[PDB]
Design a protein around this nucleic acid. Structure first.
Ligand SMILES: [Mg+2]
Ligand SMILES: [Mg+2]
Ligand SMILES: [Mg+2]
Ligand SMILES: [Mg+2]
Ligand SMILES: [Mg+2]
Ligand SMILES: [Mg+2]
Ligand SMILES: [Mg+2]
Ligand SMILES: [Mg+2]
Ligand SMILES: [Mg+2]
Ligand SMILES: [Mg+2]
Ligand SMILES: [Mg+2]
Ligand SMILES: [Mg+2]
Ligand SMILES: [Mg+2]
Ligand SMILES: [Mg+2]
Ligand SMILES: [Mg+2]
Ligand SMILES: [Mg+2]
Ligand SMILES: [Mg+2]
Ligand SMILES: [Mg+2]
Ligand SMILES: [Mg+2]
Ligand SMILES: [Mg+2]
Ligand SMILES: [Mg+2]
Ligand SMILES: [Mg+2]
Ligand SMILES: [Mg+2]
Ligand SMILES: [Mg+2]
Ligand SMILES: [Mg+2]
Ligand SMILES: [Mg+2]
Ligand SMILES: [Mg+2]
Ligand SMILES: [Mg+2]
Ligand SMILES: [Mg+2]
Ligand SMILES: [Mg+2]
Ligand SMILES: [Mg+2]
Ligand SMILES: [Mg+2]
Ligand SMILES: [Mg+2]
Ligand SMILES: [Mg+2]
Ligand SMILES: [Mg+2]
Ligand SMILES: [Mg+2]
Ligand SMILES: [Mg+2]
Lengths: 244, 122, 240, 98, 77, 75
RNA sequence: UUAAUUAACUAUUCCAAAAGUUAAUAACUUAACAUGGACUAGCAAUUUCGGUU
RNA sequence: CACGCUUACAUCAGUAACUAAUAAUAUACUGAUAAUUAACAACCAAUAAACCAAAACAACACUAAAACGUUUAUUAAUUA
RNA sequence: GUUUAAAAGAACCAACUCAUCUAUGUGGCAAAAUAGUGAGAAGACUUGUAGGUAGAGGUGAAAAGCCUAACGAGCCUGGU
RNA sequence: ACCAAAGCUAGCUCAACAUACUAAACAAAUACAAAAAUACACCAAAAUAAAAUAAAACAUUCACCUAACAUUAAAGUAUAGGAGAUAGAAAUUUUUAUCCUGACGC
């Protein structure tokens, strides 16, 4: 006895079946697509081919992403897409010596960052690379909207992105009811990331949260059979009246 | 040592363990430590009068049976509400906004023995 | 599972409350302190180390109370004394010559004149003479007498410079604090606690001291008569 | 941020398949430490008259500490992006005339 | 002073609200619809449950100042 | 309601009558209705066992039909 | 353990990171956390005890 | 009596054989039928305050400082 | 129970707790027993119920003892 | 002559197809000490794979070792190895549907 469908596609079959299929197709494709994250720890190489310094011949060199671990505490902050590097090393930088397991952790910082779109100061545990990415993107909300999920790797960042996208799509007057001119000035400088409302509330959602939201949207009480019977009787009476 | 196949009952335990066999509670504990029984929790067996009831626990063997026809919602509707609804529609007094006069109930919390929460035992 | 502490009592109570001792066991369950356990059943008497504590905030002036009775306390080495002030009683640490039916004063008024130092008096360090013996001293104004409490132990006030009190502890170390730290003048009761002679091994089991292990361990570098210089003066004045 | 590199080379897989990693492929060497490299300067355009940096409408390079703790949170300066640089350019063009 | 309360034995403070509750203008997706806990969802904050019908035995105790005999001048009984 | 207990199985959990809501009951709160990351292995094992049972039952039926056909050549 | 390789953790110390302070590029401090690289010791981790006699 | 085993307990019938370390027969096997009835026991108030002062015939004491309790005000569905 | 102003980690000696010596037993009554004979027996005492400390460890009035009949470090499964 | 021996069946094993994968029973009770209807909450947790083998030892290393891309070749090639044991690609090539499935398996 063997499995007709391998175990590697059971998740895809569960997505194409069940209530997972009733999800919006844009969210389904956003979850299906697998973009390689940006190199955060490993230093990548430029060209695909390289001359072997010992053999003096061309050989194809492929970049291998180093597996990184994200602790659950990283989801409460914005570490810029990094985490714990679990690996091995050779003490004294000598191969002939012993092998020692090592856990490299990023230097965490308790920092307060102010956002323009939401107008709130969040005390987020960010790191130096996070601050450098912010200053490179020239704005906190700019960085949030430009870096995708594969680069953020933070549920907090995804929630920030979804919230600010919903605000930009709905044009919430609650931002500055006292200064509509300032509200419009803030909204105009982010008009390149405008996403319609049909998709602005399906970016920062996980699988279980999306399933729960779809269940809440599809939850309806069962219609009593008396209504169906009365409808059928009215239809039959109309047919009998028109056939005469 | 001990057993794991027999059912864990009230007799296989110490004094501090007294599990009920499955009876339904009929009250609570009072003030001085006694048990106060509530007359609203005890089942009031509603038994009718069987004096002028002309029916026996058995039937005549010569009596013929009937075809197995389970009662369904459509047949119940056709027997109960269809005539009145058809008469009202023929007369022109049919109202899709109010169907309570035909037997339909909007909610269940209005009457005593509701159907979905199943307030009555039997 | 994890053990729960017995110290769940927010309200102050004059009557002794019950306590559950634990011999070297932390909240985990492993032995962390060797040589504790198997003691006699003891109660706990709540002690208010904050001496100057007014009953009502309306009249924060210095107040006088009367000693009721000096009893023994099994938790610590010193003897406790119940003192009533206003409408409430409290257990405090009795001084050397504190007897039944005595007067205790609690004041915080600092004055240019030195105040007569009694035994029951509780005045700030700045108002006391420069050569007195005190006990139950404090660290910060309004923190609590965490320091000397043992029977017979007493520190000595050395000098007061630039609004700052300097004391010498029983460990011959200097402690620099603010002059608003309330302290009790005199020596602690039961000055003969060191002269006691445990008659038999049973008294240690009664007090709750299990015997040491029998593993013969060779002496290391730690052993020997080390003559160390006196540690520096410990200061609590947060200088800007 | 730490930068690590593998000791043993990983065999190639050019048909879109994932590389077949092994136990010995976890041996990492710390080839570079980002926090130890010389820090760069942050360039910002002032929106007010700062005593230390200069007058309003000037681009200055300050250290990242002050740039992230003093100028941006207090609104004393904004980023040097071209979108905000165009505003300062048009302000200078309108100022130098009248 | 010295507070007579112990942090380990006191009632613990409720956990910090999830990061979804700090997003202005966004309804968090909780497990209040399934009437049971599931990991990955947000913590639903429930309103103060009010027993519309007064139950004698299982209700809270009314305050001292609510009673009609409550007076300002304290009496030493 | 169709619930998924800690054992990975799908059960039809009935509802009980309670005077308090679901978020204030001590007995109902400490119940777990979800699958842990260690239960998928046992779920797959049970699936494999049931598939094996069905497969060997099918093989038994097939062989019994073969035996009956070889015993009664009425065709 | 005075054998050969040297872990993780805990108490030292130093440097880098971060928070900052002064003046016309320069000097200085680290409450509780807290990362990486070096230093001193415990707790210790793996391995072995050449052959003819 | 508490803890633990659950019918091995009681009546009738049989033991050629099965269990008793052997016979007789039978509380220890077989088959059938019945059984332990609550007053004893289990579960069977909180909310704040007044409450320092040992049990040892406890008069009153020693040190190793000692388990075991009432009253007051508001709420404890009220009905074999 | 007796001596004792004593409930003195006092003394004689019961229930009780250990196991000094000898004799049977060594596939025995018993995978540690019986008989005779011993020490403690108001305390560093025995014991009922219930909870905790779990093996790179727990615990230990150090025997390298005990951790469900084999402990120089328990048992089961997996690598096998 | 006792004790005794003999049946051919219950059924399994290997695969191919395959709906597309936690069967049926779920009246009431079932994570209080499971099958106990019934009261003011609490709910959750991750942190590399190790060695037993080989190198006649054993420290760097030792295919798989419960992670998908399959097959014909390149090829056991380049390479990685106390350069020892051993490990080991890639670029680039081939693969035409269905039924004909039962058993030189007990
Ligand atoms: Mg058993
Ligand atoms: Mg019982
Ligand atoms: Mg019993
Ligand atoms: Mg009754
Ligand atoms: Mg004492
Ligand atoms: Mg003590
Ligand atoms: Mg000693
Ligand atoms: Mg010794
Ligand atoms: Mg290929
Ligand atoms: Mg050495
Ligand atoms: Mg060793
Ligand atoms: Mg090793
Ligand atoms: Mg060794
Ligand atoms: Mg040798
Ligand atoms: Mg030899
Ligand atoms: Mg010789
Ligand atoms: Mg038995
Ligand atoms: Mg017989
Ligand atoms: Mg019988
Ligand atoms: Mg004696
Ligand atoms: Mg001897
Ligand atoms: Mg004997
Ligand atoms: Mg004799
Ligand atoms: Mg004797
Ligand atoms: Mg003697
Ligand atoms: Mg006696
Ligand atoms: Mg070892
Ligand atoms: Mg050990
Ligand atoms: Mg020894
Ligand atoms: Mg020895
Ligand atoms: Mg054993
Ligand atoms: Mg090994
Ligand atoms: Mg070898
Ligand atoms: Mg060999
Ligand atoms: Mg291996
Ligand atoms: Mg080399
Ligand atoms: Mg060699």
């Amino acid at each position: 006895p063997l499995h007709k469908v391998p175990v590697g596609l059971w998740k895809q079959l569960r997505l194409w079946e069940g209530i997972y299929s009733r999800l919006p197709r844009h969210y389904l494709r956003s979850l299906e697509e697998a973009r390689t994250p940006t190199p955060v720890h490993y230093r990548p190489h430029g060209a695909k081919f390289k001359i072997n310094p010992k053999n003096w011949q061309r050989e194809r060199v492929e970049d291998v992403p180093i597996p990184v671990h994200y602790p659950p505490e990283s989801q409460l902050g914005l570490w810029g897409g990094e985490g714990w590097v679990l690996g091995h090393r050779y003490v004294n930088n000598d191969k002939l010596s012993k092998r020692v397991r090592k856990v490299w952790k990023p230097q965490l910082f308790q920092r307060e960052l102010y956002s323009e779109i939401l107008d709130k100061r969040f005390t987020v545990t960010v790191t130096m690379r996070t601050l450098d990415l912010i200053d490179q993107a020239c704005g906190f909300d700019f960085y949030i909207l430009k870096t995708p999920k594969e680069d953020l790797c933070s549920k907090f960042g995804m929630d920030l992105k979804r919230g600010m996208l919903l605000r930009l799509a709905r044009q919430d007057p609650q931002l500055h009811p006292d200064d509509p001119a300032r509200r419009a000035a803030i909204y105009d400088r982010y008009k390149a990331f405008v996403i319609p409302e049909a998709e602005a509330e399906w970016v920062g959602l996980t699988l279980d949260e999306a399933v729960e939201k779809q269940r809440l949207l599809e939850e309806k009480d069962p219609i009593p059979l008396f209504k169906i019977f009365v409808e059928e009787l009215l239809g039959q009476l109309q047919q009998q009246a028109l056939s005469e | 040592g001990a057993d794991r196949m027999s059912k864990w009952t009230s007799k296989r335990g110490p004094r501090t363990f007294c599990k009920g066999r499955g009876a339904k509670g009929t009250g609570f504990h009072g003030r001085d430590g006694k048990f106060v029984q509530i007359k609203e929790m005890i089942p009031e067996l509603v038994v009718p009068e069987l004096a002028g009831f002309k029916l026996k626990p058995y039937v005549n063997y010569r009596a013929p049976e009937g075809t197995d026809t389970p009662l369904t919602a459509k047949q119940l509707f056709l027997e109960t509400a269809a005539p009145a609804i058809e008469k009202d529609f023929k007369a022109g007094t049919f109202d899709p906004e109010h169907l309570e006069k035909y037997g339909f109930e909007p909610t269940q919390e209005g009457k005593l023995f509701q159907l979905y929460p199943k307030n009555f035992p039997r | 599972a994890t053990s729960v502490s017995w110290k769940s009592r927010t309200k102050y109570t004059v009557m002794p409350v019950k306590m559950r001792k634990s011999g070297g066991r932390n909240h985990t369950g492993q032995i962390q302190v060797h040589g504790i356990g198997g003691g006699h059943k003891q109660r706990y008497r709540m002690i208010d180390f904050l001496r100057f504590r007014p009953e009502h905030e309306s009249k924060p002036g210095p107040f006088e109370e009367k000693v009721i009775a000096v009893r023994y306390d099994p938790c610590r080495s010193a003897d406790i004394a119940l003192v009533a002030g206003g409408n409430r009683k409290r257990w405090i640490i009795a001084t050397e010559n504190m007897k039944a039916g005595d007067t205790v004063l609690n004041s915080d008024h600092i004055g240019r004149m030195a105040v007569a130092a009694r035994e029951g008096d509780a005045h700030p360090l700045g108002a006391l003479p420069v050569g007195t013996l005190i006990n139950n001293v404090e660290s910060e104004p309004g923190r609590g007498a965490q320091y000397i409490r043992a029977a017979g132990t007493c520190g000595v006030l050395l000098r007061k410079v630039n609004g700052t009190a300097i004391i010498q502890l029983p460990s011959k170390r200097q402690m620099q604090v603010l002059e608003t730290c309330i302290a009790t003048v005199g020596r602690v009761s039961n000055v003969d606690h060191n002269k006691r002679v445990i008659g038999k091994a049973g008294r240690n089991r009664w007090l709750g001291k299990r015997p040491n292990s029998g593993l013969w361990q060779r002496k290391g570098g730690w052993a020997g008569r080390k003559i160390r210089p006196l540690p520096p003066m410990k200061s609590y004045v947060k200088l800007p | 941020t730490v930068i690590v590199e593998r000791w043993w080379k990983v065999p190639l897989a050019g048909e879109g398949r994932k590389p077949r990693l092994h136990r010995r492929h976890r041996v990492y060497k710390l080839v570079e430490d980002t926090k130890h490299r010389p820090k760069d300067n942050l360039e910002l355009v002032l929106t007010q008259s700062v005593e230390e940096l200069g007058v309003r409408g000037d681009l200055v390079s300050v250290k990242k500490s002050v740039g992230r703790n003093r100028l941006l949170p207090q609104g004393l300066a904004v980023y040097a992006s071209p979108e905000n640089k165009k505003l300062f350019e048009e302000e200078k063009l309108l100022r130098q005339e009248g | 002073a010295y507070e007579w309360g112990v942090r380990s034995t006191r009632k613990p403070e409720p956990p910090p609200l999830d990061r979804v509750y700090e997003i202005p203008g966004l309804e968090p997706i909780t497990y209040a619809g399934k009437m049971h806990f599931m990991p990955g969802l947000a913590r639903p904050v429930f309103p103060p449950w009010d027993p519309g019908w007064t139950h004698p035995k299982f209700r809270r105790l009314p305050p001292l100042h609510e009673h009609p005999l409550y007076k300002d001048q304290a009496c030493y009984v | 309601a169709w619930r998924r207990d800690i054992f990975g199985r799908i059960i039809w959990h009935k509802f009980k009558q309670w005077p308090i809501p679901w978020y204030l009951n001590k007995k109902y709160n400490r119940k777990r209705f979800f699958a842990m990351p260690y239960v998928e292995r046992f779920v797959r094992m049970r699936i494999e066992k049931q598939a094996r049972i069905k497969a060997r039952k099918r093989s038994l039926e097939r062989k019994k039909e073969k035996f009956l056909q070889e015993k009664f050549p009425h065709l």
